[PDB]
Design a protein around this ligand. Structure first.
Ligand SMILES: COC(=O)NC1(C(=O)N[C@@H](Cc2ccccc2)[C@@H](O)C[C@H](Cc2ccccc2)NC(=O)O[C@H]2CO[C@H]3OCC[C@H]32)CCCC1
Lengths: 99, 99
């Protein structure tokens, strides 16, 4: 589909058996989700944004369904205020900016 | 044009007569540029992203050309790590997400 930018581009995602709302963010290198208890191993990471850095847990080869489009990649989990879908997964669903 | 997301969607912008590189950022409500001298009046403001808040100077009704498309809107200037073009200007140049 096509998503205008009058409002935040929030869509429904499915991860780890749960439905969530997430922001399609062309300005995010990585996908960063609000605190959730995913199974398996992880590695610590620090990611920077406007204002500074936050600590997150890096999970690899995680499946996420974004508006029915599946993507498999790295998912970071930590104290983010909004679920963010980043370019690592947006590329996999064929997402483009168009003007 | 159509922009894929395998790389950061960086474009050349012109503001205050000066060229700069900036990030097309669907995850930003607002446009935030690195410290620079802009003509006209400004008001102090604060904006919060990942990591915390930063102090910015808000310039309203500023001419800015983004990848050949002209916009006139609010620009925030402050210690941002990257020049980011947010949805307030992305809507003016007719930008949408598509997948
Ligand atoms: C390298 O990849 C990343 O940096 N990605 C992260 C990231 O911060 N990216 C930035 C762009 C960015 C920032 C700094 C350096 C390079 C690129 C935005 O794309 C996403 C945030 C999300 C957010 C919404 C609400 C509240 C807090 C946070 N938007 C944001 O700060 O916007 C500002 C400006 O407008 C305002 O609206 C929203 C808040 C205001 C870092 C980790 C994950 C995301």
């Amino acid at each position: 589909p096509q998503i205008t930018l009058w409002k935040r581009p929030l869509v429904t995602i499915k991860i780890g058996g749960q439905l969530k709302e997430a922001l399609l963010d062309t300005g995010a290198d990585d996908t960063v989700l609000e605190e959730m208890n995913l199974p398996g191993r992880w590695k610590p990471k620090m990611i920077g944004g406007i204002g500074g850095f936050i600590k997150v847990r890096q999970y690899d080869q995680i499946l996420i369904e974004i508006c029915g489009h599946k993507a498999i990649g790295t998912v970071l989990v930590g104290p983010t205020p909004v679920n963010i879908i980043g370019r690592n997964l947006l590329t996999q669903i064929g997402c483009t900016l168009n003007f």
